[PDB]
Amino acid sequence: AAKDVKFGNDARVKMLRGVNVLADAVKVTLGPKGRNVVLDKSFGAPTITKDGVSVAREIELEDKFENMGAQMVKEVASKANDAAGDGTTTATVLAQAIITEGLKAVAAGMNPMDLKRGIDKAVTAAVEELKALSVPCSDSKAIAQVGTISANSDETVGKLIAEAMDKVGKEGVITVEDGTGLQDELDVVEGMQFDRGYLSPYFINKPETGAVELESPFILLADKKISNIREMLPVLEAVAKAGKPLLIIAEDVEGEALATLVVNTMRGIVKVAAVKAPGFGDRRKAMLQDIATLTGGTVISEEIGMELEKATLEDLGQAKRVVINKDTTTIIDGVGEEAAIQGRVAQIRQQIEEATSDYDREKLQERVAKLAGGVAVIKVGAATEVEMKEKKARVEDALHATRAAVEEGVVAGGGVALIRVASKLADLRGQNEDQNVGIKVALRAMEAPLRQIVLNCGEEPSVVANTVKGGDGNYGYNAATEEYGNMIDMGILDPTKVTRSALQYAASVAGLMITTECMVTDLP
Amino acid sequence: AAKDVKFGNDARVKMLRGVNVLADAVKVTLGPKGRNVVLDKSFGAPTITKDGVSVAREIELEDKFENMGAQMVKEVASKANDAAGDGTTTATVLAQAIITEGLKAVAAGMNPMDLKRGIDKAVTAAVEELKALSVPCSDSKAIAQVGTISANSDETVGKLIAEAMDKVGKEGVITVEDGTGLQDELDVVEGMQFDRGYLSPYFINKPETGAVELESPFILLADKKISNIREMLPVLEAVAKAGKPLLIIAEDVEGEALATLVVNTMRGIVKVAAVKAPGFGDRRKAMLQDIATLTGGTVISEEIGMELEKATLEDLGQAKRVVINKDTTTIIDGVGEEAAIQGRVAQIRQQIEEATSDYDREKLQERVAKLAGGVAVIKVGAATEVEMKEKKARVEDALHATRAAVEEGVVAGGGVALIRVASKLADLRGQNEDQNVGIKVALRAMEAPLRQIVLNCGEEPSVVANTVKGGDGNYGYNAATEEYGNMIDMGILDPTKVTRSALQYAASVAGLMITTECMVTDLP
Amino acid sequence: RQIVLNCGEEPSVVANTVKGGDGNYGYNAATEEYGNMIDMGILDPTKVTRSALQYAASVAGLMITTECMVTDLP
Ligand SMILES: Nc1ncnc2c1ncn2[C@@H]1O[C@H](COP(=O)(O)OP(=O)(O)O)[C@@H](O)[C@H]1O
């Protein structure tokens, strides 16, 4: 359509005004004395949020030129959100500081590209320093402290995650779900569980548990449909003659087959449970091989050329116990050899390192976890749904932070870590004066998260900043108790991944915005 | 679209204005001197309501920022409505009081999050105190008193429910329906009744009752269709030879089968009634097993491998009498063993405790009630439909209150109970001054339901509040007779569930609203 | 109630206490205290109170029974 072009300072002023609008909404949610932002949803009740990425996504400014600036800073919150779950507000606050100070240098006549080169040079140097200050976190105490800080000082959320990471293991996956009651709960399942029910209720040999339990069973894994008992016969003769209970895995079971199985179980000839294969296509086939590796069995398929009629009792895996519900199937403790399990785990794990789809990478993480370790779900307890949504976001942020803390270690929280790295990098210079100004613009911006937390508390940011900078190592301000002290001892610990990610993403988006000469946008 | 962002006090003032608009409409309907609210319906006549949840749902404020506040307080009325049917006005009145007082503390410079932590601490402590003051209600007198208070001082509604709960039993379900006439009626059915009619009118052996009655019959339960008499023959020979009347249950009956049955009954060979199975799918199958457990019979199905042709007279259950209409089927007094009935009831009852769908939980409640106890329907009598709708809402509220009263006991009504708990909790303090202010904001809000009932009466709320607080135990004001006295003796009793639910839901929604810093909403 | 409202206290509680009290018991807004008003020194002439009530009622009566008002056009 018709395009209106604005040039020079006029474009930059409108661009900054939009950045300032989005940043101001995100800024109010920083630190513990930070307040919530309410986002109207067109259908349903308004959502009260303290997560910056949610606030940033919703805000679209009406003015065309101003909106373009707001959309560009929305990228830092989203990118930080994706790479490491928390750090979305710190990233936006750092980005706003670099743009505001950088625009002043452009007004002073500094070459914008030279400033961008200096800001990148300072950003790279700070990342190396943050790696040096990083201290590895593996102890439960540190995991609980990072969880509590990520959940806005919620100790219960921190300890629940520390306990869960305890039981599930490094391979194990922890998940967040809406809770049944006011109280938070943690459910951990070890062994092979998957979300498929009993085919008929007639198999129920524990009607007081509402379920089927089978003691030391053989397990049969079949490709395609079980069309008839006519395929099944020699295996049925063999298993019955041996005497053990049995679990039938197949992609479906036909009426003749299911009805005959019910007649045999009911009248006592063979003790048999029948369940459906999990998911669809290639991942169903893959998970069936993983189930076979766990049981120490063979997958019967047409591709390998295995008739169901030519299977024997050597070709069935085994487990210590199996338990099955109307929704869920679970297997306790395989006969599969541990070395074979680890070879198959190593295969699956190597494909995680190749996983372009993050959504499917999670599904690969579940397959490793079911084979080795356990999957836990955290019930999020709230009186009302509005409280449930904010409750879950805090729990999710804590799980994301705890995972990053194990991966890259921990550094002092409260923005003390960035104040420390800027102090170390003071002499870092650049080829030209404009690069030197760019290095300083980035160094001054690093103080902005600390100042904003203190401003949200109601303390004057300048006085606290100077005291913290004067102090050395982990000396910092506890915003909650409004007292100075050692941050790591006080328990204000934040991951080195979230701190580094926020700096890198903020610098990237900010450097491009300072260089902008003209803005082209559709006519109002 | 374009979003307008308001920050700080400007956002909170607009947010409070919306809360005040919704609350004011709900407030007029509190207590016995409370007046009705009329809600225009776009098609049909306007609805006159005294239930707050209905008024809250309809109100949507035109101003975008104000509407967001109104939508958020609509949650407390709806949530209280769902968990326990009554208490929707008390919840909204408490929520408005906490928000108005809490916003003043935020204006005084109190940390909003610290206030929320204190309000939650006071809310938890009060709930424990309300459990202590709770006195269990099981006597008919108390059940009638809670029913009368819930129906806005309607004694007839209270006694009808006391009598109904009497006959149906704890397992029994009481239901509310539009009444045939000006007078309210109560119909209680014991035994196995279900809503399916006679297949043909030719079976009518009582044409002066318009119906079929069969004395000491065998009952046959079949899966699928009865296709032919060719399946039926050996059972028909056996039953006729034995000589007893018979009731045929199946999912359908084909023309050849139905016509042959009519020929046999008409000409006197066998006395047989035929009826269709209730509902569809799995719950039809489940209810057919429950019917078999009651009759002391066997369900004939393909899954168990039971041919209709291979059934015998040992495989049929029996009842003392059966009676059937054009709409409804009812069975009087089974031959099924009581211990087997209780085992099957225990199975069904255990699945109630697992029931995620509340709608289907009610359907599980009916199945327990048909097997043990009875289902009653209360006819709601009114001259006009407008009066019918308000009449039924009061009857429904009384049934919800009576159910809660048996479950969690009763405490003094009129808001005297909350005044009492606040007085006990006066010393409860918090870690910081802001938490202490938050505890007091909640303690002062607890007086608001008592004050609003008195204000609706036209009495000045302040004077009565002070007299009630000065009095001890159940000393309280009877708003109707405008006289002070013992509330439990006066008969103003309300459930401990409804009182506790109103406090918990109000505190949850209110605490989040006080913390709001900014509001983002679509441009007008 | 207006004397009490202007001083920032609750009109209803003070009005009830004075109403319940006997004779000159009343609330001195200045000292924020209730006492015998004659002793406390808050004395007003009888004519002042009688005249106020009589004149106020007269305007109220004319007010209630006014059936027309004629004014010049804006
Ligand atoms: N009690 C505290 N005292 C000082 N700093 C804190 C405290 N709690 C959290 N912080 C720090 O404030 C920041 C938390 O910001 P937050 O509100 O969680 O959003 P985001 O991390 O996305 O910026 C982190 O740097 C954290 O270490």
Ligand SMILES: Nc1ncnc2c1ncn2[C@@H]1O[C@H](COP(=O)(O)OP(=O)(O)O)[C@@H](O)[C@H]1O
């Ligand atoms: N005659 C009465 N005297 C004093 N309090 C009463 C009387 N009747 C009902 N109440 C109390 O007023 C409240 C009833 O409010 P209601 O109009 O039924 O709507 P809701 O319960 O949803 O707030 C209860 O606390 C009840 O105990």
Ligand SMILES: [Mg+2]
């Ligand atoms: Mg965070």
Ligand SMILES: [Mg+2]
């Ligand atoms: Mg009510």
